[PDB]
Design a protein around this ligand. Structure first.
Ligand SMILES: COCCN1Cc2ccc(-c3nc(NC4CCOCC4)ncc3Cl)cc2C1=O
Length: 345
């Protein structure tokens, strides 16, 4: 076992010469040389077994990604874990290594309008597949959009991904939320658990805006500041949209705010393609029921040079619907079972 930044990476001898990439609350990613396929790969060490929530998220991530196969989505190529539940302290997911991500690219590179268009196309093409499986990504952001030197784009990090559940989307005002703050749709702060597909379209909207200027459109500094930033650009919600917010705490907060008029997109993005801003507007709609869906976004005139629904595949086996109540110890068993197919035996 090699250390990487203090963590044992128990993946050798097949995977050697490890370099730290990044991490999260319960895992670390490294590049590693695969001594079999003779390529570098990405390896995520996941260490979730001391927390039910991280176990839930580990099982979803693995189960979702094992069902998916698509050019614009990062798959799982191998899973390393111990041969018995007793000896299993971590799980390692092996994935295609990509050169960079959109976060790093936007900090260093101006994107031509043709690159923005192609990137957005690829995002939406992968998202069409995800949504067609009845899955939500729920943490779409530039650092989760990987790229290689030929500008192929793949969506990664399904750690917050969930099967859609729109009948249980309602919650109260200021309900805590885990996904990355700057890409949260307004309704998260108002009345939404983020259990419908419209949550991901908002994030893609934010990504498109950020591609146009190299800067996050809504960099909220804290939870309610995120909504402040959204309403500064979109302006005050209409009576009709405000009437869809039935929770009094949320509604009366909105009614307490000074009036704001809509900032026209062509004012924030003077050099942008007019069709790009027309799609941007439709993705960054305040009311989630009125917000554009993934297949309509693909059909938008901005993407006319790429749109080809016959070459925009859907999932063969969508998710049909309960791991919420299960303890740490039973989810470990389910993770062990879910990963059994990759064992030598
Ligand atoms: C612990 O997990 C948290 C959630 N995260 C974080 C993360 C980071 C990185 C990759 C990844 N990164 C690369 N290439 C790098 C891109 C940036 O620039 C250097 C190379 N290639 C394949 C993958 Cl899977 C995946 C994830 C992921 O799932």
């Amino acid at each position: 076992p090699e250390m990487v930044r203090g963590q044992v990476f128990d993946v050798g001898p097949r995977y050697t010469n490890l370099s730290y990439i990044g991490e999260g609350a319960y895992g670390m990613v490294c590049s590693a040389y695969d001594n079999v396929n003779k390529v570098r790969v990405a390896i995520k060490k996941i260490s979730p077994f001391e927390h039910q929530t991280y176990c839930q998220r580990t099982l979803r991530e693995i189960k979702i990604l094992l069902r998916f196969r698509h050019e614009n989505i990062i798959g799982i190529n191998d899973i390393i874990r111990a041969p018995t539940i007793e000896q299993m302290k971590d799980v390692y997911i092996v994935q295609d290594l990509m050169e960079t991500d959109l976060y790093k690219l936007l900090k260093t590179q101006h994107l031509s309008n043709d690159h923005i268009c192609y990137f957005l196309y690829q995002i939406l093409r992968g998202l069409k597949y995800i949504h067609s499986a009845n899955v939500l990504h729920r943490d779409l952001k530039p650092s989760n959009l990987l790229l290689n030197t030929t500008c192929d784009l793949k969506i990664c990090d399904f750690g917050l991904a969930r099967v859609a559940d729109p009948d249980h989307d309602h919650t109260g005002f200021l309900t805590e939320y885990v996904a990355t703050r700057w890409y949260r749709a307004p309704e998260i702060m108002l009345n939404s658990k983020g259990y419908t597909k419209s949550i991901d379209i908002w994030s893609v909207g934010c990504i498109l805006a950020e591609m146009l200027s190299n800067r996050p459109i809504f960099p909220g500094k804290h939870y309610l500041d995120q909504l402040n930033h959204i309403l500064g650009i979109l302006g005050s919600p209409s009576q009709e949209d405000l009437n869809c917010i039935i929770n009094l705490k949320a509604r009366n907060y909105l009614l307490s705010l000074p009036h704001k008029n809509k900032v026209p997109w062509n004012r924030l993005f003077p050099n942008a393609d007019s069709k790009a801003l027309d799609l941007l507007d439709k993705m960054l709609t305040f009311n989630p029921h009125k917000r554009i869906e993934v297949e309509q976004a693909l059909a938008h005139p901005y993407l006319e040079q790429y749109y080809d629904p016959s070459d925009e595949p859907i999932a063969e086996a969508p998710f049909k619907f309960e791991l919420d109540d299960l303890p740490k110890e039973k989810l470990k068993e389910l993770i062990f079972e879910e990963t059994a197919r990759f064992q030598p035996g």
